Amino acid sequence: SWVWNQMFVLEEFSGPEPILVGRLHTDLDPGSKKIKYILSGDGAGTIFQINDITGDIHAIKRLDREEKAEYTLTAQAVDFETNKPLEPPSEFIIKVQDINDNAPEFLNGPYHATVPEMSILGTSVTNVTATDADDPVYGNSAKLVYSILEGQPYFSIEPETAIIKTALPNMDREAKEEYLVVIQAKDMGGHSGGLSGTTTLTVTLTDVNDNPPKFAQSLYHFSVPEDVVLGTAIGRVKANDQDIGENAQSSYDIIGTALFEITSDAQAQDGVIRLRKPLDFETKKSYTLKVEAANIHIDPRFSSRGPFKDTATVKIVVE
Amino acid sequence: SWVWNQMFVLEEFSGPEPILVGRLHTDLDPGSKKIKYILSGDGAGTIFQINDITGDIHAIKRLDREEKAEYTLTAQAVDFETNKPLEPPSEFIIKVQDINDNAPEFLNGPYHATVPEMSILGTSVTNVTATDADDPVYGNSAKLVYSILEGQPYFSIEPETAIIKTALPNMDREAKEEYLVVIQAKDMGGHSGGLSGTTTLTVTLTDVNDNPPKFAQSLYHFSVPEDVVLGTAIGRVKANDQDIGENAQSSYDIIGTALFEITSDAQAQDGVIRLRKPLDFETKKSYTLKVEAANIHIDPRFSSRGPFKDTATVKIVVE
Ligand SMILES: [Ca+2]
Ligand SMILES: [Ca+2]
Ligand SMILES: [Ca+2]
Ligand SMILES: [Ca+2]
Ligand SMILES: [Ca+2]
Ligand SMILES: [Ca+2]
Ligand SMILES: [Ca+2]
Ligand SMILES: [Ca+2]
Ligand SMILES: [Ca+2]
Ligand SMILES: [Ca+2]
Ligand SMILES: [Ca+2]
Ligand SMILES: [Ca+2]
Numbered sequence: 001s002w003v004w005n006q007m008f009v010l011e012e013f014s015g016p017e018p019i020l021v022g023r024l025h026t027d028l029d030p031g032s033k034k035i036k037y038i039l040s041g042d043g044a045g046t047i048f049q050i051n052d053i054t055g056d057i058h059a060i061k062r063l064d065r066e067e068k069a070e071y072t073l074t075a076q077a078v079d080f081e082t083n084k085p086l087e088p089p090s091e092f093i094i095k096v097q098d099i100n101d102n103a104p105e106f107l108n109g110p111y112h113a114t115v116p117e118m119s120i121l122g123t124s125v126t127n128v129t130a131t132d133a134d135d136p137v138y139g140n141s142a143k144l145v146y147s148i149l150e151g152q153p154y155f156s157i158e159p160e161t162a163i164i165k166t167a168l169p170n171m172d173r174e175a176k177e178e179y180l181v182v183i184q185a186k187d188m189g190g191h192s193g194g195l196s197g198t199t200t201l202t203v204t205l206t207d208v209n210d211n212p213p214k215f216a217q218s219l220y221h222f223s224v225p226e227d228v229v230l231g232t233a234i235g236r237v238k239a240n241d242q243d244i245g246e247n248a249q250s251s252y253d254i255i256g257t258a259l260f261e262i263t264s265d266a267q268a269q270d271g272v273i274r275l276r277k278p279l280d281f282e283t284k285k286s287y288t289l290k291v292e293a294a295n296i297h298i299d300p301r302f303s304s305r306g307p308f309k310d311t312a313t314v315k316i317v318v319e
Numbered sequence: 320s321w322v323w324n325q326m327f328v329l330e331e332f333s334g335p336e337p338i339l340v341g342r343l344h345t346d347l348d349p350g351s352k353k354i355k356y357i358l359s360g361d362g363a364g365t366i367f368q369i370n371d372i373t374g375d376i377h378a379i380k381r382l383d384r385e386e387k388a389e390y391t392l393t394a395q396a397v398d399f400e401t402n403k404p405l406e407p408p409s410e411f412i413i414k415v416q417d418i419n420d421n422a423p424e425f426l427n428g429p430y431h432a433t434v435p436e437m438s439i440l441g442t443s444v445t446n447v448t449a450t451d452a453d454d455p456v457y458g459n460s461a462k463l464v465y466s467i468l469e470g471q472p473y474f475s476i477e478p479e480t481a482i483i484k485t486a487l488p489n490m491d492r493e494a495k496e497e498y499l500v501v502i503q504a505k506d507m508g509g510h511s512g513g514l515s516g517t518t519t520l521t522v523t524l525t526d527v528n529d530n531p532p533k534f535a536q537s538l539y540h541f542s543v544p545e546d547v548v549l550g551t552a553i554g555r556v557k558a559n560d561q562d563i564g565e566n567a568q569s570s571y572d573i574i575g576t577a578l579f580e581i582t583s584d585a586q587a588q589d590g591v592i593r594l595r596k597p598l599d600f601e602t603k604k605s606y607t608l609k610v611e612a613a614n615i616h617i618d619p620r621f622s623s624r625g626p627f628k629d630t631a632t633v634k635i636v637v638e
Contacts (some may be wrong), residue, residue, distance in 0.1 A: 002325035002409045005345035020416075054457070074610070076383035091320045097339075 004268055005092030012064045018058035021048075026077045026087040027056060035087075036080040040088020041073030048094065050075065065096035066133050087234065099143045102133030104185040104197030112202040118170035118210065126153060126166035130197045140188035144259040149198060164201070172210060174242050179203035209295055212270075212306040213241035213250045220314040227279045233263075234316065236271040239293045250295050254287030255311075273314075287316040324411030328614060329383045337377035340367075340413065343475035344374060345396045345406040349383030354406075355399040367413065369394065384415035385452050399551055419460045423454030423516030425505040433522040437489035437529065449516045450505040454506040457506035470500020483520070483611075491529060493561050498522035528614055532560035532588075534570045539633040544596045551608060552582075553635065555590040558612045569614050574630075575607030606635040 024037060039050035039057065047061040050072070057075075071094045077087035101117075106128065110140040111309030113126040132142040146162040148155060181203060187195030191197060215237060220234040241248040250269055252262050261274035294309035295301055326341040343356060358369035358376065366380040367390070376394075392411045396406035424446035425447065432445040451461040465481040467474060472495060473486030483500075500522060506514030534556060541554040560567040569588055571581050613628035614620055 001346050002406060003346055004409075004411070006342075006344070008339070008341065020327070022327065025325070027320050027322055056457070087321060090323075092323070138375070279355075 001158055003092065007057075007092075007094045008097050009063055009094060010124075011065045011096045012101060014059065014062075014100075015086040020058045022057060022186050023055035023076055028086070030055055030218075034080060035077050035081075037075060038078060039073070039075040039274065039296045040192045041075075042222050047071075048239040053080075063096055065098040065135070065215060066102060069096045069098070070094065085319060086260040090304065091258075092243045097119070098135035098138070100187055102196065104130045104132050104144060104187055104195050106130050106146065106183075106199040110200040110202060112204070113164070113301045114204050114206060115166065117173045117205045117208050118167070120264075121167065122156070122165045125166060125203065126201075127155070128162045128164065128183050128199060128201065130162075130199075132187055132195070134187070136260055140191060141187065147184045147186075149178060149182045149184040149205070150200070153179055155181055157183060165202075171205060173207065174211070175207045177204055177207075188195045207243055207245060207247050208304075209241075209243050209247040209301055209306075210304060210318070211243035211247070212302075213239035213293055213295060213310055215239060215291075215310040215312045216295070218258065218312050220312065222273075222316045223319060224275070224316060225319050226282075228275065228280060232275055234260075234273045234275060235314070236273070237291065237312065237314065238271050239269050239310065241269075241295055246297075247301075250293045252291060252293040254305075255292050259287075260289065260316075262289075282318070285318040286317075287314075287315075324409065324410075326376075326413045327416050328378055328382055328413060330384045331420060332418075333378065337379045338373050338550060341376060341378045342579060343376075343394055347405070348558075352401075353399060353582035354396050355538040356394060357397060358392070359392075360395040361462055363392065366390075367392070369452070372399075375564075377585070382415055384417040384454070388415045388417070389413065411495050417454035417457070417460055419453055419506055419514065423449045423451050423463060423502070423506055423514050425502075425516060425518040426451050428574050429519040429568065430589060431523070432483070433525060434485065434524050436492045436524045436527050438485070440486065440488045441475070441484045444485060444522065445520075447481045447483065447502050447520065449481075449518075451506055451514070453506070459510060462507065462594075463504045464508040465501045466505075468501045468503040470498060470520070470522070472498055472525070474498075474500055474522065476502060478480035478638045483522075484616060490524060492524045492526065493530070496523055498524075509581070526562055526564060526566050527561050527623075528560075528620055529623060530560045530562035531621075531627050532567070532629055532631040534558060534610075534612070534631045539631065541592075541633065541635045542638060543594070543598075543635060543636050545601075547594065549598060551594055553579075553592045553594060556610065556633065558588050559585040559627065560614055562614075564615060565616075566620075569612045569628075571610060571612040574610045574611050578606075579608065579635075581608075581610065604637040606633075606637075608633040608635075 009021045018293050036052050037055050047059060048057050049060050050057050073094060074089050074091055075090050076083055082294055115123060115125050130144060132144060133143040136142040145159050146157045147159060148157045156165045156167045159164060181201045183199040183201055185197040224234055239250045240252055256261050256266060259275060259277040261276045263272040263274055265272060289312050292309055292311055328340045355371050356369060356374050366378060367376050367378050371378050381386045392413060393408050393410055395408050397404055434442060434444050449463060451463060453460040455461040460536060464478050466478060467476045475484045475486045477484060500520045502518040502520055504516040539556050543553055558567055558569045568585060573581050578594060579595040580595045582593055584589040609630050609632055611628055611630055
């Protein structure tokens with residue numbers, strides 16, 4: 001069925017002076033009688049106002065589509081004096097059409113997203129998705145095109161879908177952990193006179209174990225009174241696998257001992273030495289330990305290639 | 320019956336970029352099939368061109384109402400691939416609306432009109448009627464208002480109907496016979512930014528007999544050889560009723576004569592004297608005539624009040 005009951009009013013402008021959108025009509029003959037038009041419905045006589053006899057309807061108000069895009073209305077046909085219906089009323093809509101006064105706009109102010117450290121160039125990161133208020137049905141009033149406006153240890157915003165990718169080969173965090181990129185979107189765009197919506201994106205990377213652990217220095221020295229019939233502990237040597245977290249927690253043990261325990265630890269990841277067997281002898285004054293400390297998992301937690309796991313020597317002297 | 324098949328396109332402008340006038344429609348459901356719109360008719364695809372799928376029709380040409388105000392057109396509904404009619408075609412008109420680019424304009428360049436000399440203030444003279452090209456159906460695009468722009472031994476152009484009247488009491492031509500007045504007409508007008516059409520009008524008056532006739536001078540002299548056994552004629556005395564034409568033609572006769580005819584005349588309106596009786600005598604040397612000469616008709620042709628009809632004396636001497 002053909003639709004013909006619709007009028008299109010361009011929104012907001014006219015400034016002052018008013019614009020007709022449609023003159024109505026019922027056909028019929030003359031013959032010494034006449035039709036006077038009366039209009040009723042939405043914002044009747046106030047927004048849209050009718051010149052009676054003719055059928056002329058100008059808008060006498062700024063129209064905002066985003067407020068309300070359609071206005072179901074009902075105008076009439078009666079004689080002037082008779083007022084008897086010279087045509088039973090019709091229902092019909094008036095539409096706007098939306099002009100690009102409405103901006104591109106992001107839902108949250110800043111955004112924060114994470115991505116696995118060293119991973120092949122172009123790895124998915126997140127979608128940023130703005131929003132234009134306008135008409136997504138006609139023209140380029142809304143069609144948006146995203147772009148990385150800045151963020152140059154590099155990611156790519158894939159322009160159609162806005163999805164962020166990385167733009168960089170590997171990306172060893174130990175260099176830089178957090179990343180700032182500023183995001184755009186053009187109304188039309190591909191065409192200037194476009195609109196401009198920006199957002200902050202805090203990008204951080206995760207970890208991997210691309211680090212063996214460290215020892216403060218290669219040769220340690222300590223000292224001790226010769227029995228302590230309690231415990232006890234003597235010294236602390238440290239590892240620092242820069243690769244944080246679980247990827248940092250390292251395992252100590254000694255590989256010139258046996259009078260000495262060595263202890264965990266999730267304390268700072270040291271490093272402590274208890275005296276196991278008590279003590280007795282001058283027979284020794286000097287003692288020696290070599291100590292392996294290494295990162296962990298339940299399957300190979302060095303899935304790359306790691307060289308040292310820092311050994312190192314401890315010299316304990318007697319008193 | 321309600322009319323809804325009509326669209327309104329404002330004429331001539333857009334300059335470049337195009338303006339939609341109406342998106343079409345047939346209702347129906349989706350369900351994995353679709354409507355593609357094809358348009359055909361007047362200046363189809365060339366003046367008015369169709370965005371197929373949507374129903375959008377912008378004009379891609381200056382439109383001139385005065386060239387053609389309406390365009391009967393026929394657009395369609397078929398599927399894209401199927402091309403089978405998803406709706407039997409509709410006939411509908413597109414209308415313009417006319418904007419005031421068209422000027423007020425008079426049919427002939429100059430105009431020439433006549434009116435009876437002394438006649439009560441405000442006597443009808445003629446209609447001047449211009450012509451605006453525009454729309455006489457909507458707004459003040461055409462409603463015209465005439466004015467005497469100049470012509471100040473005065474006439475009035477009655478502004479609604481343009482009819483010229485005299486603006487002056489009596490108006491004795493003998494003062495001035497022809498009159499120049501320049502005529503105007505404003506498009507809208509009563510409202511500036513109106514349009515401006517001017518015309519020349521040569522006004523002349525007719526006559527009445529508001530003049531007695533004249534004699535060159537009050538005393539005439541002539542002379543004559545004493546017999547002429549032929550005719551003959553002697554002298555000519557003149558009248559000049561300034562009131563021209565029939566109102567000037569005057570009647571001579573003598574009211575010390577009898578040897579002398581006096582003759583008409585539509586010669587210059589004199590004035591001639593024939594000798595009736597021949598001649599004989601020294602017995603007279605000096606002769607005398609008094610002469611009435613007067614304007615004419617078959618009922619009172621001095622329907623005002625006229626004093627002299629200039630008498631006057633002629634002295635003929637003998638030789
Ligand atoms: Ca708006
Ligand atoms: Ca808008
Ligand atoms: Ca917009
Ligand atoms: Ca790492
Ligand atoms: Ca590590
Ligand atoms: Ca790392
Ligand atoms: Ca025109
Ligand atoms: Ca025009
Ligand atoms: Ca005009
Ligand atoms: Ca006269
Ligand atoms: Ca006269
Ligand atoms: Ca006269």
